[PDB]
Amino acid sequence: KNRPNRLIVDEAINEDNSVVSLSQPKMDELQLFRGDTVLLKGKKRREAVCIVLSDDACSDEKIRMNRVVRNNLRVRLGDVISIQPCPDVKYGKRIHVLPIDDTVEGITGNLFEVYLKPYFLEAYRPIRKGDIFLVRGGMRAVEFKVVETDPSPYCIVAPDTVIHCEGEPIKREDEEESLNEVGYDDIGGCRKQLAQIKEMVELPLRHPALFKAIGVKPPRGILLYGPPGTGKTLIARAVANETGAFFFLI
Amino acid sequence: KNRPNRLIVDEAINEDNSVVSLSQPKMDELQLFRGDTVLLKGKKRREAVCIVLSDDACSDEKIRMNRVVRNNLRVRLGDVISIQPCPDVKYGKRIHVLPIDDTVEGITGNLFEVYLKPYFLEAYRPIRKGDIFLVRGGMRAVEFKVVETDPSPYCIVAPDTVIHCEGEPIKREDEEESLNEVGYDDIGGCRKQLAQIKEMVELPLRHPALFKAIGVKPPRGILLYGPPGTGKTLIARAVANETGAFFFLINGPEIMSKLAGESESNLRKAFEEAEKNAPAIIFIDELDAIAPKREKTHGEVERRIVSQLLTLMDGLKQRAHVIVMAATNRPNSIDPALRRFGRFDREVDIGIPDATGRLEILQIHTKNMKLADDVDLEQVANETHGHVGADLAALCSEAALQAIRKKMDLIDLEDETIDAEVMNSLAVTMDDFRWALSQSNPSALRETVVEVPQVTWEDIGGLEDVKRELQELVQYPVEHPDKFLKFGMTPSKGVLFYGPPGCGKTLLAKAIANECQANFISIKGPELLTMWFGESEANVREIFDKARQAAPCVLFFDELDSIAKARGGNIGDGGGAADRVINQILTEMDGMSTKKNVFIIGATNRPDIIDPAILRPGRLDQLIYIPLPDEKSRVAILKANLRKSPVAKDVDLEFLAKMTNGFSGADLTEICQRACKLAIRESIESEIRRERERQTEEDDPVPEIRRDHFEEAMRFARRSVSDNDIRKYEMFAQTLQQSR
Numbered sequence: 001k002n003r004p005n006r007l008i009v010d011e012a013i014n015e016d017n018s019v020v021s022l023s024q025p026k027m028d029e030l031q032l033f034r035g036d037t038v039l040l041k042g043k044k045r046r047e048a049v050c051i052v053l054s055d056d057a058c059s060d061e062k063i064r065m066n067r068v069v070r071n072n073l074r075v076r077l078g079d080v081i082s083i084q085p086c087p088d089v090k091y092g093k094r095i096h097v098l099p100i101d102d103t104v105e106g107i108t109g110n111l112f113e114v115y116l117k118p119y120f121l122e123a124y125r126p127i128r129k130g131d132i133f134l135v136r137g138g139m140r141a142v143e144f145k146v147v148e149t150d151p152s153p154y155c156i157v158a159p160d161t162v163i164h165c166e167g168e169p170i171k172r173e174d175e176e177e178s179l180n181e182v183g184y185d186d187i188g189g190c191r192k193q194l195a196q197i198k199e200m201v202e203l204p205l206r207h208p209a210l211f212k213a214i215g216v217k218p219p220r221g222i223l224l225y226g227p228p229g230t231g232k233t234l235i236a237r238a239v240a241n242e243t244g245a246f247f248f249l250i
Numbered sequence: 251k252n253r254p255n256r257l258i259v260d261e262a263i264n265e266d267n268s269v270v271s272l273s274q275p276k277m278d279e280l281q282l283f284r285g286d287t288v289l290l291k292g293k294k295r296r297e298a299v300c301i302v303l304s305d306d307a308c309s310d311e312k313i314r315m316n317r318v319v320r321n322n323l324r325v326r327l328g329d330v331i332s333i334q335p336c337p338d339v340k341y342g343k344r345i346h347v348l349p350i351d352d353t354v355e356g357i358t359g360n361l362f363e364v365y366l367k368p369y370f371l372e373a374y375r376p377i378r379k380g381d382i383f384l385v386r387g388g389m390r391a392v393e394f395k396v397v398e399t400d401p402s403p404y405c406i407v408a409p410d411t412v413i414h415c416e417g418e419p420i421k422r423e424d425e426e427e428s429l430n431e432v433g434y435d436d437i438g439g440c441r442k443q444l445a446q447i448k449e450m451v452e453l454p455l456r457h458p459a460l461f462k463a464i465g466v467k468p469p470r471g472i473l474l475y476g477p478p479g480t481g482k483t484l485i486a487r488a489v490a491n492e493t494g495a496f497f498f499l500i501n502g503p504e505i506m507s508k509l510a511g512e513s514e515s516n517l518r519k520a521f522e523e524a525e526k527n528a529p530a531i532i533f534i535d536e537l538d539a540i541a542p543k544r545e546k547t548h549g550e551v552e553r554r555i556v557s558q559l560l561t562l563m564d565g566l567k568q569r570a571h572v573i574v575m576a577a578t579n580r581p582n583s584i585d586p587a588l589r590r591f592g593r594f595d596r597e598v599d600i601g602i603p604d605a606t607g608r609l610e611i612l613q614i615h616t617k618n619m620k621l622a623d624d625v626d627l628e629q630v631a632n633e634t635h636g637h638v639g640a641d642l643a644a645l646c647s648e649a650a651l652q653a654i655r656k657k658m659d660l661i662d663l664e665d666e667t668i669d670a671e672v673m674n675s676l677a678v679t680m681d682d683f684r685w686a687l688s689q690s691n692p693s694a695l696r697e698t699v700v701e702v703p704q705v706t707w708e709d710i711g712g713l714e715d716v717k718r719e720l721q722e723l724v725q726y727p728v729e730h731p732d733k734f735l736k737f738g739m740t741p742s743k744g745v746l747f748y749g750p751p752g753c754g755k756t757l758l759a760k761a762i763a764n765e766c767q768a769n770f771i772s773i774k775g776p777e778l779l780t781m782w783f784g785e786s787e788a789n790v791r792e793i794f795d796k797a798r799q800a801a802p803c804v805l806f807f808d809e810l811d812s813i814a815k816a817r818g819g820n821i822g823d824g825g826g827a828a829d830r831v832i833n834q835i836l837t838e839m840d841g842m843s844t845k846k847n848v849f850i851i852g853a854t855n856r857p858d859i860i861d862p863a864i865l866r867p868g869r870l871d872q873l874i875y876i877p878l879p880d881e882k883s884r885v886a887i888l889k890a891n892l893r894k895s896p897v898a899k900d901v902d903l904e905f906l907a908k909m910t911n912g913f914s915g916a917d918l919t920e921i922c923q924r925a926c927k928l929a930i931r932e933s934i935e936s937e938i939r940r941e942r943e944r945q946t947e948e949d950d951p952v953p954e955i956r957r958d959h960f961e962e963a964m965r966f967a968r969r970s971v972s973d974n975d976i977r978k979y980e981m982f983a984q985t986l987q988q989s990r
């Protein structure tokens with residue numbers, strides 16, 4: 001029960017926060033079609049529900065998912081996850097979502113009709129209790145957590161199910177990070193340069209114990225140079241957030 | 251019982267930690283055969299058991315043993331040991347070995363089956379109780395001590411005897427050192443430089459009492475210089491560990507990062523502490539950071555630090571048990587008050603290794619890497635021109651990290667962390683080295699290279715009178731100068747090759763530098779033009795100084811007329827003779843040491859425009875005309891250039907020679923290379939045809955350059971030399987002793 005359900009996370013090409021992209025040999029091997037609600041188990045007893053679509057540029061162990069679902073499953077890029085297909089509910093009953101105080105500051109009016117209204121229109125997306133998703137608009141990005149899921153634990157969009165969610169901003173739990181921070185998706189250009197830095201600091205930062213079982217010196221001095229205003233500090237913040245290492249700034 | 255059993259330890263050529271190598275006269279004198287278990291008694295009532303094999307390059311008092319057995323016997327290199335043959339057990343019963351806590355850190359799994367299993371297979375090695383040996387693998391070196399030896403005190407390998415050794419890491423006894431430290435074996439390249447340092451610090455450090463029975467001053471200031479990253483501190487650590495002297499380490503930035511009084515106190519404390527624990531070595535690295543040039547001290551505290559170092563170095567002429575070695579980058583980058591007699595009087599240049607040295611360093615760093623068989627370190631060593639030791643260390647580490655990042659980490663999915671046996675099953679490919687060597691390694695060298703070249707007399711085709719003339723001019727004097735003294739003739743210290751462009755001047759000079767087995771410093775034409783254009787002709791002296799730091803040499807001042815040919819040639823800038831750089835060459839050549847075996851060789855393509863003050867006697871004056879090659883030499887040129895390429899039987903080199911006349915060797919090599927280019931193009935067309943198969947073992951691309959290529963590329967043969975060229979060369983010839 002180990003072989004078909006182990007793949008490694010990598011970067012994404014698609015922008016939807018619910019789609020996960022797998023290569024054609026694995027999806028015919030896994031016996032999976034388009035649209036199917038699937039479930040991902042990761043580190044620390046966490047779950048993620050996702051619609052699946054097909055892509056081309058992957059291997060047979062690579063899964064492409066956006067940053068929102070990647071942070072929802074409590075895993076990071078380059079680690080391994082377990083992927084099982086589930087059966088579909090194809091309705092909802094009464095969902096409930098709350099906003100986050102850390103993202104909502106100085107927003108006036110109601111967030112409901114302007115944001116959550118146009119979002120769940122004609123795009124069947126599954127959701128689970130206790131997740132975090134993000135909506136973009138009005139020159140902002142707003143976070144929403146799902147608290148209560150009436151019919152199943154996971155429920156797809158279903159326009160008969162209106163949203164009753166008129167609640168106060170709920171306190172963001174202090175162990176998990178916001179999704180308005182910086183990551184590999186928030187750096188435009190520099191594919192080659194991110195390739196070099198990602199291959200240079202994969203092993204020492206992700207797998208620390210490995211460098212106690214061998215006498216091999218990994219590179220420790222990296223010097224970034226380029227014209228001013230090209231976002232060099234941004235790359236370091238990104239790499240820090242994506243490997244989960246402590247970041248000090250002098 | 252003293253005579254047959256006393257020899258002195260020296261360095262090793264073999265890598266096995268159990269073999270000891272002795273010369274043929276001693277082993278027939280000692281009545282010893284191959285394979286015999288022998289016993290060595292050394293200092294402090296210690297023992298060593300060893301298998302013996304035969305070697306060639308030793309005397310009758312030298313024993314070659316590896317570092318492991320040398321440390322097992324509690325002796326060091328250059329000391330004396332006692333050697334007795336014993337009888338053999340030829341079995342074992344139940345041996346027991348333990349690992350060391352100092353070497354084993356973060357090793358997971360069991361060390362037994364992965365290491366001790368493949369080690370004692372088909373190699374009969376004797377062992378004794380209480381020794382220390384070392385095993386290499388899994389990108390580590392692990393130490394093992396033998397605790398219990400059941401049948402004899404010494405027992406040879408015997409595969410019936412399995413090893414029961416499942417024990418905890420045993421605490422390394424605190425008087426003895428680890429064998430993962432640095433020694434003379436852990437330095438690749440630098441044979442000459444280690445020879446100088448080993449002969450310089452043998453007596454003061456090994457035999458201290460000797461310098462209390464004579465008034466003789468041993469050298470106490472040694473200055474190591476060379477490019478950064480060449481491992482200068484490593485040499486000092488090595489020499490320290492091999493002589494057993496106390497090693498103190500001062501460094502530049504650490505002294506300059508403290509407050510004023512506290513930097514003064516640390517500089518004082520270091521010298522007094524190291525003088526307390528005599529015999530010692532004090533090593534100050536990054537000397538040019540702590541004591542730069544005079545005008546480069548903009549502050550005041552800097553001059554006080556330099557003066558403090560000066561007065562401490564002059565307070566050391568009383569003591570004979572302290573030696574001070576420092577490291578810099580170039581000799582003209584520190585305060586000239588330090589490079590004087592009594593303070594820093596010996597200067598050693600480490601410099602860049604060569605192909606043999608690069609092969610040495612690559613063997614040092616891949617010593618426990620478990621390479622595959624297809625990887626050819628000769629390819630790498632030939633393809634790393636411009637790399638120093640730190641770059642090759644980075645190359646090996648990067649190659650290993652590439653060989654652990656693309657597979658066997660993302661195969662660790664069912665598993666969580668690295669397995670020991672999995673880690674051991676890590677081979678590297680030649681393509682992996684091609685990747686690591688191709689990209690991401692900027693070589694850190696723009697420096698002139700000084701080495702023994704690799705072209706020999708078999709490569710130049712023809713010109714045998716010039717061979718027996720150059721052999722005379724270079725080798726005759728330095729071989730045996732007694733005849734020159736009986737007849738009172740000073741040697742000629744120069745030649746001037748003049749002739750047409752591209753007939754093998756550089757080749758000839760590199761060949762005569764090869765046979766003489768001397769270094770070869772080449773100074774191109776662009777370098778002279780650079781020194782004339784930037785108008786800094788001073789650093790020419792540096793070149794000559796470099797020549798005297800690498801003696802013997804063959805300075806080759808190629809394109810010596812390029813300055814003249816760039817200054818309007820015949821007419822321009824008034825129309826004088828001399829220029830800046832050529833004047834500086836005269837001034838440096840005249841005022842140099844008349845016998846050092848430094849041989850200056852010029853070269854030129856226009857022998858008339860060079861200023862006449864260079865061929866006056868006492869300078870380079872023995873003019874040699876390099877002639878245009880002829881038939882019997884053209885055939886030799888052609889076969890020597892084709893000697894690296896496949897060639898068939900139908901190629902008529904006789905007709906090729908007869909057909910091409912007045913062509914310089916450069917053009918014939920162009921013909922050969924362009925014929926090979928057409929051959930390469932034909933082969934790639936054959937590869938695309940046979941790649942585009944009908945469905946898409948008749949693989950042979952015909953790797954044989956047929957006559958068609960030569961007879962077709964012969965249409966692109968161009969005479970680079972006219973007739974009036976040869977005529978004005980003969981006109982310069984008649985201005986010599988031929989017809990005048």
Ligand SMILES: Nc1ncnc2c1ncn2[C@@H]1O[C@H](COP(=O)(O)OP(=O)(O)O)[C@@H](O)[C@H]1O
Binds near residue numbers: 189
């Ligand atoms: N490749 C890029 N992708 C996204 N944003 C970038 C990129 N390059 C530059 N920027 C933007 O330009 C700015 C770079 O300025 P910088 O001084 O590096 O930022 P910081 O304020 O973090 O020090 C940042 O605001 C960043 O948003």
Ligand SMILES: Nc1ncnc2c1ncn2[C@@H]1O[C@H](COP(=O)(O)OP(=O)(O)O)[C@@H](O)[C@H]1O
Binds near residue numbers: 614638
């Ligand atoms: N000839 C050589 N043999 C072995 N290793 C060398 C050699 N030359 C350079 N190296 C390596 O290059 C590095 C030199 O850098 P250096 O600054 O001198 O070392 P350190 O860290 O001791 O100060 C060392 O890691 C050494 O292993």
Ligand SMILES: Nc1ncnc2c1ncn2[C@@H]1O[C@H](COP(=O)(O)OP(=O)(O)O)[C@@H](O)[C@H]1O
Binds near residue numbers: 709757808915
């Ligand atoms: N006698 C020879 N034997 C072998 N190769 C030669 C010979 N003469 C010339 N060559 C070729 O000529 C080239 C060397 O030219 P060189 O004489 O250094 O030019 P220059 O005269 O401008 O210094 C080499 O590439 C070599 O292949």
